[PDB]
Design a protein around this ligand. Structure first.
Ligand SMILES: Cc1c(Cl)nc(C2CC2)nc1Cl
Ligand SMILES: [Mg+2]
Ligand SMILES: [Zn+2]
Length: 325
């Protein structure tokens, strides 16, 4: 079922060298991959090599894996290839700035989990699949798309010449697949609320312990949320342009619901565009600000993400007040 890259695609990626100018730029939390489309697969190779090393993965298998993953992201307005690389870049910036807190196996599993976290997204939410009793919802009762994204990741890894993790021992292979599974499932925002509440309690009571596996899993889960939502941490023009894509995707879902005779929620209704700024204020106060606040408490080097999120919240307030561009 997985689409496979052509020889020309992976061989082409093998010869790419990142321009020197961008090396200083890629290290920064606010970096926007937007203006460098041709370089996205190359940027991911670069990030894997800088975090793990050139010897970590067999270059040919890595390039084949990356180009087949790209091929399995769909032409949807938001949950696409650009999103995958954006999320992976945020993870790289988090991992770089907190490098030894994490094991070599965690750094490789997380960068891969980020690139694959929305694989084969169809442009439909878990709400749509569960309300219209789609077969995916029967198969995966909760975290429907996230279970699908993980199944797709394993399916790519099973393709001839794509198993980038085959050189790990039998124990490390099962360990990395678990790191990936947990990380991808954690991208379901429904799980985020409880995860952030549990982490805030652990941090406030002084019980949070990164040597404790269940605590590590939660910290990793919050990092996945922080990366998934990072369009809210970019410079305002970038954040605004990504919000346009977010809403284009939701509006297409809303259109499909309307065709089935079910009225969508206001956020998915293109005829309700005027409610977007109030909706964004709600999203930042309920989801993004608490997310980056808790992440900054646990990992102080991630503070630039919280600063940038606060700045964009401020910009959404300006939009509501009529002070826009
Ligand atoms: C990053 C992100 C996500 Cl996942 N969801 C939403 C929904 C309110 C439109 N907004 C943002 Cl800014
Ligand atoms: Mg997702
Ligand atoms: Zn995502």
């Amino acid at each position: 079922h997985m689409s496979i890259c052509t020889s020309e695609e992976w061989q082409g990626l093998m010869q790419f060298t990142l321009p020197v100018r961008l090396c200083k730029e890629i290290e920064l939390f606010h970096f926007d991959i937007g203006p460098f489309e041709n370089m996205w697969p190359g940027i991911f190779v670069y990030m894997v090599h800088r975090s793990c090393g050139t010897s970590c993965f067999e270059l040919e298998k890595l390039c084949r894996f990356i180009m087949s993953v790209k091929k399995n992201y769909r032409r949807v307005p938001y949950h696409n290839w650009k999103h995958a690389v954006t999320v992976a870049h945020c993870m790289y910036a988090i991992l770089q700035n907190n490098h030894t807190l994490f094991t070599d196996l965690e750094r490789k599993g997380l960068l891969i989990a980020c690139l694959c976290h929305d694989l084969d997204h169809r442009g439909f939410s878990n709400s749509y699949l569960q309300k219209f009793d789609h077969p995916l919802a029967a198969l995966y009762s909760t975290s429907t798309m996230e279970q699908h994204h993980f199944s797709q990741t394993v399916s790519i890894l099973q393709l001839e010449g794509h198993n980038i993790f085959s050189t790990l021992s039998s124990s490390e292979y099962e360990q990395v697949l678990e790191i990936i599974r947990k990380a991808i499932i954690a991208t379901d925002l429904a799980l985020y609320f409880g995860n952030r509440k549990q982490l805030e309690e652990m941090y406030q009571t002084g019980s949070l312990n990164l040597n404790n596996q269940s605590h590590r899993d939660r910290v990793i889960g919050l990092m996945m949320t922080a990366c998934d939502l990072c369009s809210v941490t970019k410079l305002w023009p970038v954040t605004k342009l990504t919000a346009n894509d977010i809403y284009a995707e939701f509006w297409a879902e809303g259109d499909e619901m309307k065709k089935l005779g079910i009225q969508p929620i206001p956020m998915m209704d293109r005829d309700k565009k005027d409610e977007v700024p109030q909706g964004q204020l709600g999203f930042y106060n309920a989801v993004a600000i608490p997310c980056y606040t808790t992440l900054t408490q646990i990992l102080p080097p991630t503070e630039p993400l919280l600063k940038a999120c606060r700045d964009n919240l401020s910009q959404w307030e300006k939009v509501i007040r009529g002070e826009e561009t």
